[PDB]
Design an enzyme around this catalytic site. Structure first.
Site, PDB file in Angstrom:
ATOM      1  N   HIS A   1      64.042  10.280   9.131  1.00  0.00           N
ATOM      2  CA  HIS A   1      63.577   9.394  10.314  1.00  0.00           C
ATOM      3  C   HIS A   1      64.517   8.877  11.194  1.00  0.00           C
ATOM      4  CE1 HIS A   1      63.780   6.053   7.515  1.00  0.00           C
ATOM      5  NE2 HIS A   1      63.587   5.254   8.505  1.00  0.00           N
ATOM      6  N   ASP A   2      65.616   8.291  10.823  1.00  0.00           N
ATOM      7  CA  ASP A   2      66.882   7.687  11.402  1.00  0.00           C
ATOM      8  C   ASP A   2      68.106   8.452  11.500  1.00  0.00           C
ATOM      9  OD1 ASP A   2      65.117   5.591  12.393  1.00  0.00           O
ATOM     10  OD2 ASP A   2      65.319   4.580  10.587  1.00  0.00           O
TER      11      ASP A   2
ATOM     12  N   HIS B   1      71.050   0.853   9.737  1.00  0.00           N
ATOM     13  CA  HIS B   1      70.382   2.197   9.750  1.00  0.00           C
ATOM     14  C   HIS B   1      71.562   3.284   9.308  1.00  0.00           C
ATOM     15  CE1 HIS B   1      67.647   0.555  12.869  1.00  0.00           C
ATOM     16  NE2 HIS B   1      66.834   1.215  12.137  1.00  0.00           N
TER      17      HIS B   1
HETATM   18  N1  LIG Z   1      63.691  -7.365   8.888  1.00  0.00           N
HETATM   19  C1  LIG Z   1      63.684  -7.011  10.474  1.00  0.00           C
HETATM   20  N2  LIG Z   1      63.922  -7.820  11.404  1.00  0.00           N
HETATM   21  C2  LIG Z   1      63.940  -7.519  12.476  1.00  0.00           C
HETATM   22 CL1  LIG Z   1      64.180  -8.601  13.789  1.00  0.00          CL
HETATM   23  N3  LIG Z   1      63.932  -6.412  13.002  1.00  0.00           N
HETATM   24  C3  LIG Z   1      63.686  -5.519  11.938  1.00  0.00           C
HETATM   25  C4  LIG Z   1      63.770  -5.797  10.582  1.00  0.00           C
HETATM   26  N4  LIG Z   1      63.320  -4.578  10.010  1.00  0.00           N
HETATM   27  C5  LIG Z   1      63.274  -3.636  10.559  1.00  0.00           C
HETATM   28  N5  LIG Z   1      63.278  -4.239  12.109  1.00  0.00           N
HETATM   29  C6  LIG Z   1      63.306  -3.141  13.240  1.00  0.00           C
HETATM   30  O1  LIG Z   1      62.356  -2.518  12.998  1.00  0.00           O
HETATM   31  C7  LIG Z   1      62.482  -1.148  13.845  1.00  0.00           C
HETATM   32  C8  LIG Z   1      62.119   0.051  12.961  1.00  0.00           C
HETATM   33  O2  LIG Z   1      60.660  -0.145  12.915  1.00  0.00           O
HETATM   34  C9  LIG Z   1      63.930  -1.136  14.239  1.00  0.00           C
HETATM   35  O3  LIG Z   1      64.127  -1.367  15.797  1.00  0.00           O
HETATM   36  C10 LIG Z   1      64.668  -2.150  13.322  1.00  0.00           C
HETATM   37  F1  LIG Z   1      65.125  -1.766  12.189  1.00  0.00           F
HETATM   38 MG   LIG Z   2      62.926   4.326  14.716  1.00  0.00          MG
HETATM   39 ZN   LIG Z   3      63.709   3.353  10.556  1.00  0.00          ZN
END
Ligand SMILES: Nc1nc(Cl)nc2c1ncn2[C@@H]1O[C@H](CO)[C@@H](O)[C@@H]1F
Ligand SMILES: [Mg+2]
Ligand SMILES: [Zn+2]
Length: 338
Positions: A115-116, A75
């Site tokens: 957004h983040d 992030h």
């Molecule tokens: N590839 C990803 N694997 C996992 Cl386990 N969690 C992920 C991945 N890509 C995004 N996220 C999660 O998705 C959320 C954002 O939609 C966040 O809590 C975190 F970034």
């Molecule tokens: Mg979020």
């Molecule tokens: Zn995000």
């Protein structure tokens, strides 16, 4: 305009899906959002809509990008640039172009940038359990998601030189503000299945029913009129922001693995901190000493990604993304080797 060569070469094929976002990160020195923002905002023609100068946009893109934490593995500014790239790609498709209005295109690209913003490398559940300053501020309800949007407008409006929304109309700003706020809040994962179901029931099933008639001139106008209403546009915007946010499994295999390693590392830091401080372990499976990253990614794709992008593909038509999803899924299966 006067961009140096390496960074300029990194942003050549930026309209394409296959995009080297990490070369841009290395080229820009952890400042990919400002350079990618300048081109993307100009290409759509956002400052002509907002009535801002180039210097107002540069000051805006700088101050938000500074508030993105470089210490965070996943992030950070590079993630928001990747989401901004994913956002622009979906807006550029024929289904989204003909459905949405120019005001929505601006709201999407702005939302993707912020957004983040000011992410602490931690989940909402961590902050509620820890009793953080923002958890108490937002009452354990959309803690980070409300903080991202609220701080973004504090930075923009609070300083005159940073304010891209300076010369807009009274009505045009409030509709834009309500649009951006809704898309940023829609990224909250507790409301994941709510936003996916509302998309399928209100858009895909009616569109599937109307497509049974054929491609007659009167019938296409009913397909247009139904989708173009304010309610369904919002549901498309809620779906577009959600997909672009977690589009990393639909990327080329090099980027998929890199995004997977970064977000995984961000959990292991959180899990180590929760054990030492004595907090309830909300993410037990994501520990460095026990987690299988390939097996973790398969669980994430099956639960969140596969059903969501199935709906988003059926609407927009994304043959490159879904082919990459199949290639990446089988790669995670292949890494077991036992
Ligand atoms: N590839 C990803 N694997 C996992 Cl386990 N969690 C992920 C991945 N890509 C995004 N996220 C999660 O998705 C959320 C954002 O939609 C966040 O809590 C975190 F970034
Ligand atoms: Mg979020
Ligand atoms: Zn995000």
């Amino acid at each position: 305009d006067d961009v140096p060569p390496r960074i300029a070469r990194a942003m050549e094929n930026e309209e394409y899906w296959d995009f080297d976002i990490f070369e841009l990160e290395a080229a820009t020195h952890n400042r990919p959002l400002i350079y990618l923002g300048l081109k993307m905002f100009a290409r759509f023609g956002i400052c002509e809509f907002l009535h801002c100068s180039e210097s107002t946009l540069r000051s805006w893109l700088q101050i938000i990008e500074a508030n993105y934490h470089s210490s965070n593995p996943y992030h950070n500014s590079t993630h928001s640039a990747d989401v901004l790239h994913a956002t622009a790609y979906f807006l550029s498709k024929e289904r989204i172009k003909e459905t949405l209005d120019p005001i929505d295109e601006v709201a999407a690209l702005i939302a993707a940038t912020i957004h983040d913003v000011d992410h602490p490398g931690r989940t909402n559940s961590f902050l509620c359990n820890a009793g953080s300053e923002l958890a108490i501020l937002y009452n354990d309800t959309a803690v980070l998601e409300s903080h991202h949007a609220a701080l973004a407008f504090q930075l923009t409006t609070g300083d005159d030189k940073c304010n891209i929304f300076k010369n807009m109309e009274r009505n045009d700003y409030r509709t834009l503000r309500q649009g951006i706020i809704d898309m940023v809040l829609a990224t909250e994962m507790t409301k994941h299945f709510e936003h996916v179901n509302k998309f399928v029931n209100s858009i895909n099933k009616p569109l599937a029913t109307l497509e049974e008639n054929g491609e007659t001139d009167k019938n296409q106008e009913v397909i247009n009129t139904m989708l173009r209403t304010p309610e369904n546009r919002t549901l498309i915007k809620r779906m577009l922001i959600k997909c672009a946010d977690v589009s990393n499994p639909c990327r080329p295999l090099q980027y998929c693995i890199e995004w997977a390693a970064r977000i995984s590392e961000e959990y292991f830091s959180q899990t180590d901190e929760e054990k030492q401080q004595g907090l309830p372990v909300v993410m037990p499976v994501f520990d460095r000493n026990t987690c299988s990253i390939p097996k973790s990614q398969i669980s994430f794709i099956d639960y969140f990604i596969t059903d969501m992008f199935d709906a988003w593909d059926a609407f927009v038509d994304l043959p490159d993304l879904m082919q990459h999803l199949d290639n990446n899924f089988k790669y995670w299966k292949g890494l077991d080797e036992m």
